[PDB]
Amino acid sequence: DIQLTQSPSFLSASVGDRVTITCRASQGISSYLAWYQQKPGKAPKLLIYAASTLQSGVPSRFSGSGSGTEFTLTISSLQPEDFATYYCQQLNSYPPAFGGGTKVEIKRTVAAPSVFIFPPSDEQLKSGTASVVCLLNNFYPREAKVQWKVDNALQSGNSQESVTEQDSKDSTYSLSSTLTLSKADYEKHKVYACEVTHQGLSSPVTKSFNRGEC
Amino acid sequence: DIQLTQSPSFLSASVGDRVTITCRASQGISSYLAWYQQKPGKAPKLLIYAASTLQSGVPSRFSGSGSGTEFTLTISSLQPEDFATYYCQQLNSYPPAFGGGTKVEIKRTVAAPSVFIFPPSDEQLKSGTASVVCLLNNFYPREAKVQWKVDNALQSGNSQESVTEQDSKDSTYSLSSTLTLSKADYEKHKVYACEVTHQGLSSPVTKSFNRGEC
Amino acid sequence: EVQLVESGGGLIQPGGSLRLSCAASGFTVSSNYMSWVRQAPGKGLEWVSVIYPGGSTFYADSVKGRFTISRDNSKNTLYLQMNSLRAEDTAVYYCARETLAFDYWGQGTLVTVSSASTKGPSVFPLAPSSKSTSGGTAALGCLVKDYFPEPVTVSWNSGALTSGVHTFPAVLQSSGLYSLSSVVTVPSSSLGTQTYICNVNHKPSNTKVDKKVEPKS
Amino acid sequence: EVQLVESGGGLIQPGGSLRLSCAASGFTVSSNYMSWVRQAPGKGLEWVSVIYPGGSTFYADSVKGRFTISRDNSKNTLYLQMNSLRAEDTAVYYCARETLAFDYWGQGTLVTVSSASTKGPSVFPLAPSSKSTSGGTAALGCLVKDYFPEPVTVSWNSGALTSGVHTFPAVLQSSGLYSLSSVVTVPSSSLGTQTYICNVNHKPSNTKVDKKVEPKS
């Protein structure tokens, strides 16, 4: 029997508020564990000691609440800069069990994207392939749609997107969609268009170019 | 003592005929071996079983004749598509001895080559060397002669040829001769010529270009 | 105070091996509980091994055996010599100084794929254009594609521009190679005016190329 | 039915080594007589090793010792771990499922030279010309030269044209590097009209280049 700790993940809030995260303990543990802050693409940093005695070098926003089981952390008066996951552990015992991690989102309001379409560089068309990039800059609701169209034909299954972590300054997202074609197939059509749908747009925005027009 | 099997190789015939290939066995073997078809640049395929019980997935043109020793295969009613070698083996015994292989040619009649000379590409002259290719396309008698001439001087010892396997469709050969020079030495002469001699030509054909003439 | 740095990650195939060196930048690795923490990408953490100030091992569950930890106090180095990687550990490795809890633990990567490409970038500049321009600002960037060895970096002007510079997560194609594109916005009055050169560095290989992005011809 | 494929060939020097994996695409390598057949180029075949359904080795004469065969039934893989290659085996390797005779045996290569160049092509397009033109047809091609790692391929239009496409045997120069040229004829009315791009792929390296051939300027 090992302990299996659990967490109600995927939080979403606004700044200056109260939020509270609990950590189950599916066995009788005592009162010695720890919380960590894992910013994305970085190393963890422990906040709560082996109970609630918050380790030094931290602000006054965290309040670890300890018990026999069902431990619980609480953030009051949020600040835009805590974009990361929070884990549980369990000191003392050698092989320790870890949590499941809770990402926490940060609500904003309404901010449409700047859109921009980039045709393939002349160097790449030598190589024999065409990447067509479309960029969506800064934007709260990430539930954006990127529809590629080639000569007004909606393109399915030759694109890839990725999205950035919520920005620590202005709490926005940015998205890059890449359409990949062969040189041969690229040279068979004229208008390349990228149509972005988003809540901050009253009707969708299309940025487009015409292959071969300086 | 291991068995050393032998074969009278280098056959030549025409289509629809009878040909017969024997396999010596320089020790008393019983009657268990096998024949293989080795098309050039491929994997073998066994035709005759451990005697004459031809393995399935083969046409009715092979007739393995078995004995104590001196085994013999026979093709009747040839078909243009058997350009490969035929080996002997010797099942049963672990380390087995293999044959020597018999290539089989396919007579045709008379078909002169299309000749073509290619000057060196401008990219290569940057690098500092000049390849001058001369191509001889489709042709039965492979006993063709390629004489390079540079400004009417017969060139000896700076060329290389290679020849294709007899074509499975039209039973012809094709030959490529490459003349290799330095950029410096290339730029010292004007006419590059390739003179092909062949039985289908009443007198030799020369294809030639003049260095530096678009 | 203490600034643990680690080195030794790369790419290898099964039955391979690899020594990792938790370089104790900082003091007294002779008398501290040290450990290795592992996480696969997109996953939670996992614990690997631990050394006592006095010498003991206690390896984890699945990596029981086939995996060795040691220290060197005079060099202030922790040594992790592994071998026969089931390639199922392809993970991001951390070494942390357990001080009654943990904390103080650098970072370091590894991948154990059953292949090798190790090639590097294919860089193109995505020019600033009026289709990207809107009012006061316009965006330009660099597309770095088709590379296997995951850790790759693109900076803008040797690390100068930090405004608007946003590198998007790399994408894994069906071909098996990664690709990404990093873009930055800059006032539209400044399309070609100043320097915007993306510095592409590929650390598993040794690729370093600077590409300038200029408005379309 | 059964479509044995093999992988693992390349280039190495003496005292080297190499694992070959006869990947049993097809069924039941747990209970079949399997073997390795070898041939040097321009030569007849030769037999190497054999595994029994039950486990036995019986290696050949000259490769007695220094050479190891095994199977894996759950993976359906045959394993051939060799080492200390006298470089005198530079050969084309086959693995065949002995079924009372033989048959069913894929293919796979190897070279054990005492050097390494591993470079790749030097491609030029040999343009169609009137000196190559005669009546209804004219010939054009691609010259791919100066490479060591013998297996190299050139296709026409990603494998489209199969008419007139003829790749000639590579030639080995005094420099020690190979060279070849592949040519195809096409109606003289169609000199530049359609696409004729030679796709050069070098498998020991990772070279892939497409070159277009057009009539002379």
UniProtKB/TrEMBL annotation, chains A, B:
Domain of life according to the entry: Eukaryota
Name under which the protein is recorded: Ig-like domain-containing protein
Residues of the full protein shown: 130 to 239 of 239
All copies of domain Ig-like, residue ranges: 113-210
Paired cysteines (S-S): 134-194
Coiled coil: none
Residues that hold Zn(2+) 2 according to the record: 138
From TrEMBL, chains C, D:
Cystine bridges: 142-198
Superkingdom to which the source organism belongs: Eukaryota
Chain ranges of the Ig-like domain: 121-214
Subcellular location: Cell membrane; Secreted
Subunit structure: Immunoglobulins are composed of two identical heavy chains and two identical light chains; disulfide-linked.
Name the UniProt record assigns to this protein: IGH@ protein
Gene: IGH@
Part of the intact protein present: 123 to 237 of 465
